[PDB]
């Protein structure tokens, strides 16, 4: 077809516009009062400039040869804009350098601008110009109107589409791309620039020395499988996951582990007597300077997990404090029956024992009951790591450990979050967290969010910028009742990550309150129970 | 000129064992045959490599090679490789494997001609003759399969594009030897993973003779990034000439070596406790298949007596620096002096009383430490016994942890533990271990930490009646000390040898019952010793 031969791509950027339901169409703001709805965007004008200028000469022959057969017979690219589009560009910037500049304008002639700048009066009269020009690729660089007419006439091979994860005022939008006409094959890394997260996605038209290649196969002569889905999961079902080419979005660090356990997981009956797929040892790294890694492939609520962190920081072991705020994370572990079954016959219901908060603020003190004044009993690790970050940032001993071996049996249950280690470099703070037991379907999503918030909390009260939250999983498992749920999750394409704003006046780890925590521009898919 | 072996894609393949303070080089692996058969009887995994390499053909490349070969000579069923062997090698093949299946068998001989043979084989009497056969035949690649005379003369005439060479890491009686490869003529480019088969480790090395739509998407998506001056430390490429010149780096030792590279190139300049200076990064993961090898580094000489005496000393719950100095083991010496203890505020600590460190915490976690002479019978928690009981009776527990990081006791220790915690995992009668190291000296310490917990995984595996599987090493704050660098540069340009094996006296069935002579390291092949500051 036309768009395949003359390599007509489209490239854009769309912000959001004034429960919430989100979809691919949420990102559709192009222009306001002539200019872009956002101010500029250093990273986008970088991506745009590098896409529309990049050419591979030593790969043209294939395109001139093939573009000729169709018709019957310094290298550059084409940029097709509208007048309104062409006008809004400042003059300092025109024509767009190292680019063959075309302009759709009924009411303009070639005599009114320089020589190597083309004007065209209608759409089909570009096939003309491409047929008779020397170019690499033809980028449709916009107009609402220029995108609309060019897309609905199937003239577009791919759409290089930027997702600006922030709302602006808008007067012109992108057209509702049809998910049965185009599908996403590529999702880039998420980035901050000019005070917003953005990522880069690629839509493609649906179809309705080479010596050490062999060395590769020899060294692969021992691999275990030859299509027996290792476990009976059926790759077939997640066509969309398997159909993506580049999965650079950080959320795939999570999804790829779900994939890996499903596909290669060891079938096991666990302590619940219930059924898991388990592997051992994974790392995840999230860039807390670029984004806040709250999963987008399903809805996540963070009030509960924030109140639970504030409760840890206060040193509380009192289950009832959380139940009074309807945070029910710990409810099942405070009942007569659960504590009895832990042989804790002498323990008040909702007295969870010397768990996180107590170890954090009192490690080595003799646990009595959940109402004791423990003030100045045992070691305040939390106080200790905050002062080490501040006075000995280069210390390799900044750990916060909740696995007190003496106290485990006293605990409602031994912790899953064994320890945090901190690392300071150039006013930047990173945190490793080791988790001994990882429920990939229900737990780990929340766990990523908690320890990311904590990272910001520590960093802010130490006047450091947050850098990496690093997540080491020990026993990484998927309960069997989650599999049909997680397969739905794998086929959803992640949205750009929100940001977290902390109230910046808070400088004691002890002085935070729920209202000091704001998630910003959280775009998500609909809620799934991992559970029906 | 355009060489005969490139046109006709002539390769060699072989397997070499070692032969009856030694110095070690690639000429260690040189043993081909004995009394006419292989010195080892059958190595099945190597068998399977040999079959895989000598029968794989890729149809789509044939069209390019045929053209190339016609170009060279002036011309215009099912693709098979050619195999070429000495007459002695032909007779050493089992009758029922002759001729080699889905291969065109070419035999070299003078005593014998086509009439002396029943099988679908070509006889030639002359190396000349092979080039003529090859220019006549339709075939993918041509493989020289020995024996020694044949390897000798083909290599002699640089008729080999690459050698696919198998290092059998064991010693057998041998009458015939591979030629000493000239390193000007052939350099290594690739080295495989390491494996066990028929009671020996082996690896696979390769000597070399000295829709592009979704293709730009890749370049767009890498738009943003660091340059070659925002590759933080431009320490010189040239220094790692050998390491960068390798294409495939699948030998597990490269997990350790690649972390060194990454830290040397991306590392953060920091100061430290000693005041020395480090390149640092934060959070790495190494996995070692202890069922396929014992991951004792080969790029430098390592001795394991000290760290074995240290491990046993741990399991006994000892905190006594003298127990170790009396076995002439100096691992914990410096940490035990008057000056070091006084500087730790341990002014009431006897010299070489290292306090409630690993031993004490594995057997007595939560007990009040007194001195290194105290019987702590049934005080604190015996973690070691506890994790042994859990692996035996509750293998699916996600709570099989050993933890040395008693926060209570840190300041009372000579120094706080580097090795924070061990977690165990049981599937299918096999035992994996994760160890989290909070601070890691990539130069001096990690080499030994890898050995220490690998040995410990075997000890626990064995006394719980399970087989080893993976030791998994998580590095937290991972650092090269400045004055280790030059030494690490030399190491990185060394190619690993196949890992040794670890043998445990199997009679031992209680954790507390092992002694130094229950540990053998068989087949340690290694590069010359290095001092990490010079
Ligand atoms: N987000 C992004 O990536 C981009 C956003 N923008 C923003 O887009 C907005 C401008 O878009 P919108 O107003 O449509 O502007 P357009 O660029 O679509 O301009 C439309 C004009 O182009 C001409 N035109 C359209 N179709 C044809 C045709 N088939 N043949 C000949 N001429 C044709 C006419 O010009 P004439 O009047 O001369 O006949 C028409 O009125 C601005 O806010 C701009 O900043 C621009 C580029 C990229
Ligand atoms: N470890 C490994 O990878 C391998 C080991 N081996 C082992 O090596 C031993 C056998 O090899 P080794 O004794 O060298 O013997 P070879 O297999 O190399 O025997 C050489 C014989 O082949 C013929 N020959 C060789 N070159 C020529 C030539 N240029 N022109 C004509 N004939 C030629 C001659 O046969 P004739 O005398 O009959 O004229 C010669 O005596 C056995 O132990 C075997 O199992 C073999 C292959 C691989
Ligand atoms: O924050 C938490 C708490 C629990 N778990 C999971 C791990 C296991 O699935 C289960 C805890 O039970 P054990 O691992 O202790 O058996 O819940 C998490 O993933 N994260
Ligand atoms: O088993 C060990 C013990 C120590 N070290 C190194 C790490 C540091 O270089 C130093 C200890 O210093 P701190 O981490 O305690 O600051 O010893 C190791 O690499 N491995
Ligand atoms: N070629 C032959 O006759 N014997 C043989 C047996 C085993 C392995 C190999 C090797 F090529 F991998 F080394 C060769």
- Residues A382/A339, Cβ–Cβ less than 8 Å: no
Pairwise CA distance, residues B167 & B525, whole Å: 11
Among B473, B468, B354, residue whose Cα is nearest residue B422: B473
Q: Which ligand is nearest to the CA of A355?
A: 3
Distance from the B318 Cα atom to the nearest Cα atom in chain A, whole angstroms: 19
Cα B74 from chain centre: 47
CA angle B157/B162/B164 to nearest 5° reads: 120
Q: How many CA atoms lie within 13 A of A510 on its CB side?
A: 8
Pairing of strands A196-205, A158-168: antiparallel
Chain A residues within 8 A of B189 when measuring between CB atoms: 212
Pairing of strands A77-82, A138-142: parallel
- Residues B282/A423, Cβ–Cβ less than 8 Å: yes
- Residue B86 Cβ < 6 Å to ligand 2: yes
- Residue B78 Cβ < 6 Å to ligand 2: no
Among A16, A9, A52, residue whose Cα is nearest residue A37: A16
Pairwise CA distance, residues A10 & A115, whole Å: 25
Bridge-partner residues for B287, per DSSP? B472
Among B39, B42, B48, B147, residue whose Cα is nearest residue B91: B147
Pairwise CA distance, residues A261 & A247, whole Å: 18
The fourth-level CATH superfamily of domain B4-209 is Dihydrofolate Reductase, subunit A (3.40.430.10)
> Rounded to 5 degrees, what are φ and ψ at A39?
-75, -90
Bridge-partner residues for B208, per DSSP? B162, B187
- Residues B168/B195, Cβ–Cβ less than 8 Å: no
This entry's atomic model was obtained through X-ray
Q: Which of B282, B418, B436, B481 to mutate to test the pocket of ligand 4 (most atoms within 8 A of CB)?
A: B418
Among A353, A335, A371, residue whose Cα is nearest residue A414: A353
Structure-token pair, residue B473: 């090493």
What are the CA-CA distances from residue B232 to residues A35, B279, B307 (Å)? 38, 11, 36
What are the CA-CA distances from residue A144 to residues A28, A149, A150, A472, B529 (Å)? 10, 9, 10, 46, 69
DSSP notation for A92-156: GG-S-TTEEEEEE-TT--GGGS-SS-EEESSSGGGHHHHHTS--S-EEEEE-HHHHHHHHHTT--
Which residue has the least CA distance to atom 33 on ligand 1? A104
Q: Tell me whether residue A518 is annotated as binding.
A: no
Structure-token pair, residue B9: 């894609």
Pairwise CA distance, residues A170 & B53, whole Å: 62
Cα A420 from chain centre: 23
Q: Which of A210, A218, A281 lies closest to B164 in CB terms?
A: A218
What HEC string does B32-80 produce?
EEECCECCCCCCHHHHHHHHHHHHCCCHHHHHHHHHHHHHHHCCCCCCC
Cα B344 from chain centre: 39
Which residue has the least CA distance to atom 11 on ligand 3? A437
Pairwise CA distance, residues B204 & A366, whole Å: 58
Pairwise CA distance, residues A29 & A19, whole Å: 21
- Residues A501/A515, Cβ–Cβ less than 8 Å: no
Q: Which atom of ligand 4 is nearest to the CA of B415?
A: 15
Distance from the A349 Cα atom to the nearest Cα atom in chain B, whole angstroms: 24
Pairwise CA distance, residues A250 & A285, whole Å: 8
Chain B residues within 8 A of A440 when measuring between CB atoms: none
Q: Which of A11, A46, A85 to mutate to test the pocket of ligand 1 (most atoms within 8 A of CB)?
A: A85
Computed from CA positions of residues A478, A479, A483, A488, in that sequence, does the dihedral angle turn out positive or negative? negative
A–B interface: beta-carbon pairs under 8 A: 201
Say if residue B124 is exposed, middle or buried (CB neighbours under 10 Å; 0-12, 13-18, 19+). Answer: middle
Structure-token pair, residue B112: 């014998």
Q: How many CA atoms lie within 13 A of B227 on its CB side?
A: 2
Q: Which of B283, B380, B479 lies closest to A470 in CB terms?
A: B283
Chain B residues within 8 A of A419 when measuring between CB atoms: 405, 420-421, 436
Pairwise CA distance, residues A35 & B485, whole Å: 54
- Residues A434/A402, Cβ–Cβ less than 8 Å: no
Pairwise CA distance, residues B46 & B202, whole Å: 8
Pairwise CA distance, residues B52 & B13, whole Å: 12
Cβ separation of A474 and B398 shorter than 8 Å? yes
Pairing of strands B501-504, B519-522: antiparallel
Catalytic residue among A416, A420, A431, A462: A416
Which residue has the least CA distance to atom 9 on ligand 5? B14
Q: Which position has the token pair 């030897």? A: B177
Active site residue A462: no
- Residues A479/A439, Cβ–Cβ less than 8 Å: yes
Cα dihedral A395/A400/A405/A409 (nearest 10) = 180
DSSP structure class, residue A363: B
DSSP structure class, residue A58: T
Pairwise CA distance, residues B445 & B238, whole Å: 27
- Suggest the residue from A219, A226, A408, A410 to mutate for an interface test with chain B (most B CBs closer than 10 A): A219
Cβ separation of B401 and A418 shorter than 8 Å? yes
Q: Which of B42, B100, B132, B148 to mutate to test the pocket of ligand 2 (most atoms within 8 A of CB)?
A: B148
> Rounded to 5 degrees, what are φ and ψ at B449?
-55, -45
Q: Tell me whether residue A392 is annotated as binding.
A: no
Pairwise CA distance, residues A467 & A285, whole Å: 10
Cβ separation of A222 and B48 shorter than 8 Å? yes
Q: Which position has the token pair 């306001």? A: A32
- Residues A363/A404, Cβ–Cβ less than 8 Å: yes
- Residues A188/A246, Cβ–Cβ less than 8 Å: yes
- Residues B5/B159, Cβ–Cβ less than 8 Å: yes
Pairing of strands B430-441, B467-481: parallel
Pairwise CA distance, residues B285 & A181, whole Å: 43
What HEC string does B352-421 produce?
CECCCCHHHHHHHECECCCCCCCCCCCCCECHHHHHHHHHHHCCCCCCCEEECCCHHHHHHCCCCCCEEE
> Rounded to 5 degrees, what are φ and ψ at B342?
-55, -40
Resolution of the experimentally solved model in angstroms = 2.7
Cβ separation of A378 and B408 shorter than 8 Å? yes
Cα dihedral B292/B297/B303/B308 (nearest 10) = -50
Q: Which ligand is nearest to the CA of A164?
A: 1
- Residue B357 Cβ < 6 Å to ligand 4: no
Radius of gyration of chain B (CA): 28
Radius of gyration of chain A (CA): 28
Structure-token pair, residue B205: 């090395």
Chain B residues within 8 A of A472 when measuring between CB atoms: 283, 285, 436, 474
Pairwise CA distance, residues B233 & B245, whole Å: 20
Long-range contacts of the stretch B177-180 (C-beta < 8 A, 24+):
B177/B19, B177/B30, B177/B31, B177/B32, B177/B148, B178/B14, B178/B16, B178/B29, B178/B30, B178/B31, B178/B32, B178/B148, B178/B151, B179/B148, B179/B151, B179/B152, B179/B155, B180/B27, B180/B30
Pairwise CA distance, residues A139 & A99, whole Å: 10
Bridge-partner residues for A425, per DSSP? A428
Pairwise CA distance, residues B389 & B386, whole Å: 5
Pairwise CA distance, residues B525 & B497, whole Å: 6
Q: How many CA atoms lie within 13 A of A361 on its CB side?
A: 20
Pairwise CA distance, residues B520 & B530, whole Å: 23
Chain A residues within 8 A of B421 when measuring between CB atoms: 403, 418-419, 434
Bridge-partner residues for A12, per DSSP? A161
- Cβ–Cβ contacts within 10 Å for residue A481, how many? 14
Q: Which ligand is nearest to the CA of B390?
A: 3
Q: How many CA atoms lie within 13 A of B150 on its CB side?
A: 27
Which residue has the least CA distance to atom 18 on ligand 1? A143
H helix or E strand, kind and range, residue B165: strand B162-172
Rounded to the nearest angstrom, the distance between the alpha carbon of B87 and the centre of ligand 2 is 5
What are the CA-CA distances from residue A190 to residues A136, A250, A496, B225 (Å)? 28, 7, 6, 13
Cβ separation of A221 and B53 shorter than 8 Å? yes
Which residue has the least CA distance to atom 6 on ligand 4? B441
Pairwise CA distance, residues B270 & B289, whole Å: 34
Chain B residues within 8 A of A200 when measuring between CB atoms: 220-221
- Residues A449/A300, Cβ–Cβ less than 8 Å: yes
Among B72, B495, B11, residue whose Cα is nearest residue B257: B495
Rounded to the nearest angstrom, the distance between the alpha carbon of B439 and the centre of ligand 4 is 5
Q: Which atom of ligand 2 is nearest to the CA of B148?
A: 14
Q: Which position has the token pair 């399969």? A: B145
- Residues B313/B362, Cβ–Cβ less than 8 Å: no
In terms of DSSP H, where are the helices of A7-104? 42-53, 61-71, 83-88
Cβ separation of B247 and A212 shorter than 8 Å? yes
What are the CA-CA distances from residue A390 to residues A377, A429, A449 (Å)? 24, 11, 24
- Cβ–Cβ contacts within 10 Å for residue B476, how many? 25
Instruction: Using the CB atoms, write b or e for B494-515: b if 16+ within 10 Å.
Output: bbbbbbbbbebeeeeeebeebe
Say if residue B147 is exposed, middle or buried (CB neighbours under 10 Å; 0-12, 13-18, 19+). Answer: buried
Pairwise CA distance, residues A268 & A290, whole Å: 38
Pairwise CA distance, residues A352 & A369, whole Å: 9
Contacts of B523 (CB under 8 A, 6+ apart): B169, B170, B171, B200, B201, B498, B500, B501
Q: Which of A215, A280, A397 lies closest to B434 in CB terms?
A: A280
The fourth-level CATH superfamily of domain A2-205 is Dihydrofolate Reductase, subunit A (3.40.430.10)
What are the CA-CA distances from residue B446 to residues B75, B449, B477 (Å)? 60, 5, 12
Structure-token pair, residue B60: 């789509």
Q: Which of B220, B280, B425 lies closest to A280 in CB terms?
A: B425
Residue ranges around ligand 1 (CB below 6 Å): A 12-13, 30-31, 34-36, 81-85, 88, 104-108, 121-123, 141-146, 149, 172
Chain B residues within 8 A of A269 when measuring between CB atoms: 396
- Residue B37 Cβ < 6 Å to ligand 2: yes
CA angle B188/B193/B196 to nearest 5° reads: 120
3-state helix, strand, coil in chain A (%, to 5): 35, 25, 40
Pairwise CA distance, residues A470 & A289, whole Å: 13
Rounded to the nearest angstrom, the distance between the alpha carbon of B86 and the centre of ligand 2 is 3
Rounded to the nearest angstrom, the distance between the alpha carbon of B435 and the centre of ligand 4 is 15
Q: Which ligand is nearest to the CA of B271?
A: 4
DSSP structure class, residue B427: E
């Amino acid at each position: 077809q036309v768009c395949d031969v003359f390599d007509i791509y489209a490239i854009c950027a769309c912000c959001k516009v004034e429960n919430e339901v989100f979809n691919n169409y949420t990102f559709r703001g192009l222009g306001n009062k002539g200019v872009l709805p956002w101010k500029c965007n250093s990273l986008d004008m970088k991506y745009f400039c590098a896409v529309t200028t990049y050419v591979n000469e030593s790969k043209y022959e294939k395109l001139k040869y093939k573009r000729c057969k169709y018709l019957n017979k310094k290298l550059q690219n084409v940029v097709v804009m509208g007048r309104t589009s062409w006008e809004s560009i400042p003059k300092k910037f025109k024509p767009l350098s190292n680019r063959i500049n075309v302009i759709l304008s009924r009411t303009l002639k070639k005599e009114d601008f320089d020589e190597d700048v083309y004007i065209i009066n209608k759409v089909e009269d570009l096939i003309v110009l491409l047929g008779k020009l020397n170019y690499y690729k033809c980028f449709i660089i916009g107009g609402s109107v220029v995108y609309q007419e060019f897309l609905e006439k199937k003239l577009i091979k791919k759409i290089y589409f930027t997702r600006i994860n922030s709302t602006y005022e808008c007067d012109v939008f992108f057209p509702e791309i049809n998910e049965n006409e185009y599908q996403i094959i590529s999702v880039s890394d998420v980035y901050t620039s000019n005070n917003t997260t953005l990522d880069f996605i690629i839509y493609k038209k649906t179809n309705n020395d080479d010596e050490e290649e062999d060395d590769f196969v020899y060294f692969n002569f021992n691999k275990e499988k030859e299509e027996k889905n290792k476990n009976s999961i059926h790759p077939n079902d997640f066509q969309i996951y398997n159909s993506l080419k580049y999965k650079y979005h950080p959320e795939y660090q999570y999804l790829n582990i779900i994939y890996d356990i499903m596909m290669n997981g060891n079938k096991q009956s666990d302590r619940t007597g219930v059924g898991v797929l388990s592997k051992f040892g994974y790392i995840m790294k999230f860039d807390l300077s670029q984004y806040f890694p709250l999963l987008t492939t399903k809805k996540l609520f963070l009030r509960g997990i924030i109140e639970e962190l504030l409760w840890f920081i206060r040193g509380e072991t009192n289950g009832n404090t959380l139940l009074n705020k309807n945070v029910r994370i710990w409810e099942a572990n405070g009942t007569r029956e659960f504590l009895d079954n832990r042989k804790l016959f002498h323990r008040e219901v909702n007295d969870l024992g010397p768990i996180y908060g107590f170890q954090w603020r009192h490690f080595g003190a003799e646990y009595t009951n959940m109402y004791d004044n423990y003030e100045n009993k045992g070691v305040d690790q939390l106080k200790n790591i905050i002062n080490l970050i501040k006075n000995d940032p280069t210390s390799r001993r900044i750990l916060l450990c909740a696995w007190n071996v003496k106290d485990l049996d006293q605990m409602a249950l031994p912790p899953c979050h064994i320890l945090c280690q901190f690392y300071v470099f150039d006013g930047k703070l990173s945190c490793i967290m080791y988790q001994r037991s990882c429920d990939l379907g229900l737990g780990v999503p929340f766990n990523i969010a908690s320890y990311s918030i904590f990272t910001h909390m520590i960093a802010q009260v130490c006047n450091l910028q947050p850098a990496q939250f690093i997540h080491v999983l020990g026993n990484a498992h998927v309960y069997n009742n989650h599999i049909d749920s997680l397969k739905i999750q794998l086929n959803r394409i992640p949205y750009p990550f929100p940001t977290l704003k902390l109230n910046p006046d808070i400088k004691n780890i002890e002085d935070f309150t729920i209202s000091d925590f704001t998630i910003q521009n959280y775009v998500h898919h609909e809620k799934i129970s991992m559970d029906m």
